Amino acid sequence: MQYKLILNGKTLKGETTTEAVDAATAEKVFKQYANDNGVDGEWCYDDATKTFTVTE
Ligand SMILES: *SCC1=CC(C)(C)N(O)C1(C)C
């Protein structure tokens, strides 16, 4: 499935996507994406829109 990440950081704001078999796996990918891009924040996930947010 295609999942979306919305980053709401102090400096980084944007959207990206990944393909994963379940939300747990997507979450791993996006937590790494956020960290790799210097973001350390508060997470939310709506399976009804396959969308994660990370907000600082
Ligand atoms: S908890 C904040 C949040 C993120 C997102 C998945 C986009 N949502 O629908 C709400 C607004 C609940």
Curated annotation (Swiss-Prot):
Localization of this protein: Secreted, Cell wall
Covalent S-S links between cysteines: none
Source organism phylogeny: Bacteria, Bacillati, Bacillota, Bacilli, Lactobacillales
Placement of Sequence repeats on the sequence: 3-56
Full-sequence portion shown in this chain: 304 to 357 of 593
The species this protein was found in: Streptococcus sp. group G
Protein name stated in the entry: Immunoglobulin G-binding protein G
